[PDB]
Write a protein that binds this ligand. Structure first.
Ligand code: NA
Length: 330
């Protein structure tokens, strides 16, 4: 089997992407944030504290003839941005882009943190990291990918995120029309439960490529590119008037600037992030200070190849016995 679903930016900045997901019988379609940096499929629901719901579509398990309470199971998750959610668990039928899993753990939120409530466009998350990170207790649950895997034509999924445009998540096949050149595959460590890999270096604009190992994770659920402070300083030094602002919480730059590109290495291959991808717009409405899309990972304890990086590539998440990542230009 295969599946193919379109993913759509939630706003003009590509702050996140949402993908429609069918849950239950009859289907309830929720728009979920596919997150290769976590392993829980959780949803706003009929159980979510009413004051914490503001415009999201909810899953109502009592209206699904295939929903079953997973007795005694609870979940609770905290993300890198400080947000969190928790609740109880149902199993139900979940379909993505025509690919169906029966008996998927659907984590129903009783509580969500303010950043979730305030984002009316995201109805929950669908985790695509390794199932070792799933938070369900006392019986850990499998991701949608892990439950689908054995049925797929190939044990893979691909992320093809758009710049200010829709893109695609495919399950079970490579769309050879969706990228240019060849796919470069690189090793993955699953030791932290992430799609963790090592970039071979970087370049700023038309500058020379610096060969250096950068360990980090491919994380579709993170907006920005978080890299070591040395790399990030080297990038923003090429933008007149850019500075790190402790008050704003990262590098800012004059909105009048034209940003240089950023290249990262994948083995001997190179992915180029156009400068425009690095502009996250005014820090507050009407400001002439703009927020940068490349930020320091110092204090986060891992480098994160978030959407700024991934949307410059066609990315293969290869879930074979030994997982690997693939990157192609597009
Ligand atoms: Na921000």
């Amino acid at each position: 089997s295969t599946g193919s679903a379109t993913t759509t930016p939630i706003d003009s900045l590509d702050d996140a992407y949402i993908t429609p997901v069918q849950i239950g019988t009859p289907a309830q379609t929720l728009n979920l944030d596919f997150d290769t940096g976590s392993s829980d499929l959780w949803v706003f629901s009929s159980e979510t504290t009413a004051s914490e719901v503001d415009g999201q579509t909810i899953y109502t398990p009592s209206k699904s003839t295939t929903a079953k309470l997973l007795s005694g199971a609870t979940w609770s998750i905290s993300y890198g941005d400080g947000s969190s959610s928790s609740g109880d668990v149902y199993t139900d039928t979940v379909s993505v882009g025509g690919l169906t899993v029966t008996g998927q753990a659907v984590e129903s939120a009783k509580k969500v943190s303010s950043s979730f409530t305030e984002d009316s466009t995201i109805d929950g998350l669908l985790g695509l990291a390794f199932s070792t990170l799933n938070t369900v207790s006392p019986t850990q649950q499998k991701t949608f990918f892990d439950n689908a895997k054995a049925s797929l034509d190939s044990p893979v999924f691909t992320a093809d995120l758009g710049y200010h445009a829709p893109g695609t998540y495919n399950f079970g096949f490579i769309d050879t029309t969706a990228y240019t050149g060849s796919i470069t595959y690189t090793a993955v460590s699953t030791k932290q439960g992430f799609w963790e890999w090592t970039s071979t270096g970087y370049a700023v604009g038309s500058g020379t490529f610096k060969s250096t190992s950068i360990d980090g994770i491919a994380d579709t659920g993170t907006t920005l590119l978080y890299l070591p402070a040395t790399v990030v300083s080297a990038y923003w030094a090429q933008v007149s008037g850019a500075k790190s602002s402790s008050s704003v919480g990262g590098y800012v730059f004059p909105c009048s600037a034209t940003l240089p590109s950023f290249t990262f290495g994948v083995g001997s291959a190179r992915i180029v992030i156009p400068g425009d991808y690095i502009d996250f717009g005014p820090i507050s409405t009407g400001s002439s200070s703009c927020f940068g899309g490349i930020q320091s990972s110092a204090g986060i304890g891992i480098n994160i190849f978030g959407d700024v990086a991934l949307k410059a590539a066609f990315v293969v998440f290869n879930g074979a016995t030994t997982p690997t990542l693939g990157f192609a230009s597009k």
